[PDB]
Amino acid sequence: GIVEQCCTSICSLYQLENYCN
Amino acid sequence: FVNQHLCGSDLVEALYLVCGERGFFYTKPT
């Protein structure tokens, strides 16, 4: 999930955008 | 944007910040 890439690793906006519904 | 370790609260808010109305994978208000 978004948590692994962002919390376990550093994410990117685009990666954050992917999860916007 | 930024290069930080976001987790739930910080991340979710990061999404509500990024996604905004589109909502996002976690739990919207209601």
From Swiss-Prot, chain A:
Disulfide bonds join C6-C11. Coiled coil: none annotated. This is Insulin A chain. It comes from Homo sapiens. The chain holds residues 90 to 110 of 110 of the full protein.
